[PDB]
Amino acid sequence: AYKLVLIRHGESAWNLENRFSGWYDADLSPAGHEEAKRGGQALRDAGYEFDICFTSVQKRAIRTLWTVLDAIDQMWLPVVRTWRLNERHYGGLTGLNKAETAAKHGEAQVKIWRRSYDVPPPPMEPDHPFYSNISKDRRYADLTEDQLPSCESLKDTIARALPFWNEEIVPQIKEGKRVLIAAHGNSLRGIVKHLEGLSEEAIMELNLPTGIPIVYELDKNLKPIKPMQFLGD
Amino acid sequence: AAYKLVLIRHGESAWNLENRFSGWYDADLSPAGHEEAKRGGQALRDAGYEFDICFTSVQKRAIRTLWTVLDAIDQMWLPVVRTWRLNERHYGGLTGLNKAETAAKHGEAQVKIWRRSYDVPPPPMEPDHPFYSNISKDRRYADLTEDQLPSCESLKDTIARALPFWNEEIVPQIKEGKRVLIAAHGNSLRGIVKHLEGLSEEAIMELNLPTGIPIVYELDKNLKPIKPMQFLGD
Ligand SMILES: O=C1c2ccccc2C(=O)c2c1cc(NS(=O)(=O)c1ccc(Cl)cc1)c(O)c2O
Ligand SMILES: [Cl-]
């Protein structure tokens, strides 16, 4: 009867969550920060305790985790960060709003990318304003040329998140360690897809709420014994 | 030089203000303490410091100081390792008492002696102490053996349990070329400084490390400083 909690960060600065923020290291907006505080407050009111926390290397998820740990008085917990829990890399679309994306690539192609599980957007090229900012960021300096994405389909995102789940998170859960994961929509999709054994179509329709603790009760085989629960009013 | 090490004592706590002995009590930063840590971080940012790994205690005044620094230098993504071994000295029965209550109960003479002694501990925190359960039964210490969980510490005891972490967990990282940041407490950092500079018991007790100011060491490959520590800031 292992217990697992996931939280998806809230709003990021400059409307970036509506602009394919992806691997660009946008901070939380004050509103996104307040959401995290409400979620942490919900975990406290419910008396939740953790033994270890996992997050991405992106500050919007990390600050979400910090806000939560602060709210529940568990700032002393071990924290593990990994690029593998990063948001999906949206390639050349990173930073563009809906109108700019449509104008640049056309409604037909945008619809195809939106509904596809395995078609990536175009690569982020050297002329992209974020190209050097992301690709040469020191935090990814140890990644092999294979590992560092120029773009990702949802399938690619899920493919690189799962090995971390299996090799680092699973063992902790099986040891009775109470895990908290603070990450992004698409990396959490990968975990939820594997947990509940959803299909590609189903995972693409799943939209995890932000700033709300997501609770899983898992059996001995790390299979959910009930549907995901949310904490709050 | 071969290596660079940065140390920082946590910013002023809410109890530093009230002049109460915190020790292992988990007092938070005061608003001023938070501003100190932020200034420290800005100094590190202005000088272009980059780190590869951070160490801190399990006390929030040090952790929050580290968080504030990492935020200021845009390195929130760094791996962070927390250990009770970098905790502040455990002040035993003095925990929670202020200056007046301490002199009232123990006399100025005894206080003088504790103050100037390297190896004499204050009285033990016993079960009837009002902070006994709050500290002694905190689950963050659940994995400590019976003899690791102190009821009180001399400065010698503190340094004695800090240095093993330094030698076993931090030294190898430094020699691996990792640029280390340690955000901790006056007395746990004293142990590190004493070992780096091979200082005498009296010299280390005269060393006052200021809250929230980054301290830089330039080290040779054997981790010997090539010059005096430098304070970073305005
Ligand atoms: O009583 C102690 C003391 C007691 C036992 C071990 C170490 C110390 C110690 O190191 C110390 C003390 C007092 C003061 N000055 S004091 O204004 O009386 C004081 C008191 C308590 C606190 Cl929290 C702060 C200041 C100092 O400057 C010290 O370095
Ligand atoms: Cl952290």
Curated annotation (Swiss-Prot), chain B:
The modification N6-acetyllysine is found at residue 105. CDD domains: HP_PGM_like. Substrate binds at residues 9-16, 22-23, 61, 88-91, 99, 115-116, 186-187. The active site is at 10 (tele-phosphohistidine intermediate), 88 (proton donor/acceptor). PANTHER family: PHOSPHOGLYCERATE MUTASE. Belongs to the phosphoglycerate mutase family. BPG-dependent PGAM subfamily. Catalyzes the interconversion of 2-phosphoglycerate and 3-phosphoglyceratea crucial step in glycolysis, by using 2,3-bisphosphoglycerate. Also catalyzes the interconversion of (2R)-2,3-bisphosphoglycerate and (2R)-3-phospho-glyceroyl phosphate. This is Phosphoglycerate mutase 1. The lineage of its organism: Eukaryota, Metazoa, Chordata, Craniata, Vertebrata. The gene is PGAM1.
